[PDB]
Amino acid sequence: KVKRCVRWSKAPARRSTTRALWGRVTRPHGNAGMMRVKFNGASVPASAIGRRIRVYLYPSQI
Amino acid sequence: KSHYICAGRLVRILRGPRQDRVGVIVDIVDANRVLVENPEDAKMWRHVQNLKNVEPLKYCVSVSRNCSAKALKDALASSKALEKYAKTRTAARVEAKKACAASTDFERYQLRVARRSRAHWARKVFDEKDAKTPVSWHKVALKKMQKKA
Amino acid sequence: AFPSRKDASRAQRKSAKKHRPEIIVIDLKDHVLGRAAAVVAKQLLLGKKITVVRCEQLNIAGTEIRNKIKYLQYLRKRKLTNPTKGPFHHRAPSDVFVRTVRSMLPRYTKRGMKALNSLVAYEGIPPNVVRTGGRVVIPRAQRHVCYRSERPYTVLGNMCKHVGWKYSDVVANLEKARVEKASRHHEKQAKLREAWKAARKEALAKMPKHNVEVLKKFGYA
Amino acid sequence: SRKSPEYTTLRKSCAPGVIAIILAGRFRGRRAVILKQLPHNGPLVVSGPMKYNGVPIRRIDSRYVIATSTKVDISSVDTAPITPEVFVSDARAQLQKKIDAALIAAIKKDAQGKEKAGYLRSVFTVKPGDAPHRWNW
Amino acid sequence: VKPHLRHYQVVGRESPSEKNPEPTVYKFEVFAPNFVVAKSRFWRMMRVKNKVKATHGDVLSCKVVKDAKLVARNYLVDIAYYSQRCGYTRMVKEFRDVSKTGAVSQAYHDLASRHRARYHNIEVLNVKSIPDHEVKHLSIAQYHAPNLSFPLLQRRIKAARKDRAIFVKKNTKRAVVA
RNA sequence: GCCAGAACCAGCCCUACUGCAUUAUCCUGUCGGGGGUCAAAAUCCGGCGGGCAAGAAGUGCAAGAAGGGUCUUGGU
RNA sequence: UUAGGGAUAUGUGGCGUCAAAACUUAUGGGCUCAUUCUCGAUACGUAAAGGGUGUUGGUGGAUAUCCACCGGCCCCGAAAAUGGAUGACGCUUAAGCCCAAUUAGUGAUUGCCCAUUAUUCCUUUGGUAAGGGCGGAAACAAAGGAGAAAGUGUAGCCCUUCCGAUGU
RNA sequence: AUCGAAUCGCCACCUACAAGACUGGAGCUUGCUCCCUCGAAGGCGCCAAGUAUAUUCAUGAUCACAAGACA
Ligand SMILES: NC[C@@H]1O[C@H](O[C@H]2[C@@H](O)[C@H](O[C@@H]3[C@@H](O)[C@H](N)C[C@H](N)[C@H]3O[C@H]3O[C@H](CO)[C@@H](O)[C@H](O)[C@H]3N)O[C@@H]2CO)[C@H](N)[C@@H](O)[C@@H]1O
Ligand SMILES: [Mg+2]
């Protein structure tokens, strides 16, 4: 179903069935360049294992 | 043809803390180590390299085993082996990554407008030579069409 | 699996463009059988869609007589009470590799069944796989870096033809007919491959010279 | 000194004149020029200019900006307080063009200044094979 | 690999007793990973040769010995080792290395492979750089040829840990995955 | 009295920036006696002349009053 | 070695896939080839005498070649009753065996992965628990707020601090 | 036609083929010398159809699935 996203009243064109869970990279994990992330207030669903996660360039340090 | 490990053979270091630096074999320890020195470079003092980390080049100064560290600087000056290496294409690929690994975002933009220039010119030269000879797929099919339609 | 009329009318009601998923196609000529299988078993389980090609060219270390006996010790196993419920012994090189991948997966969950149905594993290069992009390779598993060249090795298409697998000669005539066909296609366009590179050397000095000494700093001349 | 409006804690790379990358928001991936920083450790204020990439005078903060090595050396007008951006008006449409044309005035008198005007029109995206963690900016 | 053993010169002595008002001071060369191992190999040898304990014991010095110029030399690592059958076998074992402490390290890596002897079942005696014309075995003497010239065949050129990949493109230096 | 973002305090947890001692079985200089070579440089041993091998050593001790964390604590 | 939870760091054991970690690390050294219960491989933990002109080191004799000995890995010795097990796949420029490192003769520290452990931060609960406050300081209407009990045990008189916590 | 969705690199230049004790070509001293194609890039794509004073972009207001998606 189309549940309620942000800018529901301000921007009714981004109203979608699309949801999103958010997190932060906390620390590296091993020598091979994997990251150890924690999602905000919850955990990532186990359905997401093997599925696409986007990591961003913000918050910026450079 | 492969280039032998001998005293005088210039090797390039593969993946040490050097990764790109050339050096001259001044002594062979055993079946897997040599002594490597290039007096022209600061980081290339007389050290011990494993032969899994070296790559023998086509150049070889006429110097003896366990040289005197001042007749080595004489040997690669008369041979001009560092300058013959400095105009090869593989050495240009070494100094090209050193620009890419030091590029700012503005000189990555300059490389993109340089490559889009050359690409735009090579596809309009390819245009105005495919009208004369029917080479491409647009021009083979139209040449075998207008001859019978 | 051809798409049904419910899956065909929706590609007409919605004007569906012809879609291909992001599929990585490995050419397994001269690869270590279990080193390639472990690289593939990890990538499939990280969500990669992988088509595997040329499984009759995989290598297993040791004498051909040695690896053929190890398959016959495997074929000795069967459920004695009812062998229709037994271990099923697949003889194709394309099916030996699917098993070797599968025994490196969590086979008895749904995440390991979603990853074993992401692998296809042909043998030879079939006509649907040929013109779909350049094949890739696994350079940490390629027998010229992984086997000591004095030691014998065993081509999987030759071990498997003597334990079963009655389609060895069919694959050998489908791949003789391909390399003859793909070398006729490659003598063609040699006046197209030379046409572009004599236009990419001619694009220099027809382009402005302040974009060439930035094209020579980064070594792209 | 922390309660003073001139108290900043902003990075030494996000100076006025430094060409930025927007990374977020509406105009993501565009290249905008950093004009100044608002008082009481406020957000950055970037113009594009709109002549080049379509980015108006807008607020953004430091953590949503990659500041690069390339500066244009603006010394332009700073009459953009913390209150044109409060609850296009003809004031903000005039404050745009008065700072807009002062940018192109300062873009072109820069050495290699036409190369930088084209640099402000390009779009930063992440290609499918490039590593932003190994780059100088 | 800049070897795992270091040349310690452990100087020590029994103790000023009233039986023995001035005792004998002993010098000892040991190749040890650190000086705590090196002091204990010293008191091992004070016990089994001089009836001196470490309790009634002074270590006057335990300092490392710096190596040399790095030059390819020939070392006679006159070495002994204990196995349970045929105990205390002593061999001579000429080697070919750039330093003296690296030559003993090579001896500990092929007393471990050729004979399966560990660190504490090995005693090392009289490591000396010998000239070329004294080398007896032809598997070390073959490097004194002034015109060696061998090729590096059958190599394992791996990528440089920053650009290593998983799927490259079969004739191409690309990286389709990783 | 809901969800996010940044900022700044404090606390705590990370990691950058290093000094004091030590070299000698060692460094360098030449005359030997030794080597090998087409001839000779080296490996090697010995005389007495000098010494600092000086981000010099992977050898002993290190006290060098931050840039990043804190959906790893509390606050405004 | 065990209250209810986080963060960091470990231990035993590990780092080819299953399965977290060397996206199969080194810019370390050797040794090993084994053809129908199929070389080998995580202690406790469940094949020998003997043999080998397989290979790789040693020791002592002799005239580039012989002779006697000793060791490492590998083979032979080594034959059972459902199909079968280094845990599985597999591995042989090991993913095996013995040594050794930690990003590598570069310039000194701690490669990283996992606990009901450790350190530390919260909350609970109990102490051979340890301290403080409890004579309402003044002042304050509506159109800054409430509490303050001399107390074993409560919705605990209120705060601060410290240690312990499993169990038939 | 429900249907809003997750996906985010395109090519009639890759999409032929062997080889690693070699694989640019030759010499003969067989480990060195010599030749140009110099032996370590498949091309594109990343905001003017192309490196040149060209002309829209806000108010979607400071992050939010990219509110776009025929390349
Ligand atoms: N398991 C039963 C289900 O639990 C659901 O809730 C489940 C989750 O959706 C839920 O997660 C919520 C999440 O919705 C929301 N985005 C954030 C919230 N903080 C999370 O809750 C989590 O964090 C807090 C920590 O104190 C707790 O309240 C909660 O117990 C914990 N599960 O916690 C439960 C995870 O076990 C719903 N109540 C309902 O679907 C159903 O009752
Ligand atoms: Mg117990």
Ligand SMILES: [Mg+2]
């Ligand atoms: Mg009871």
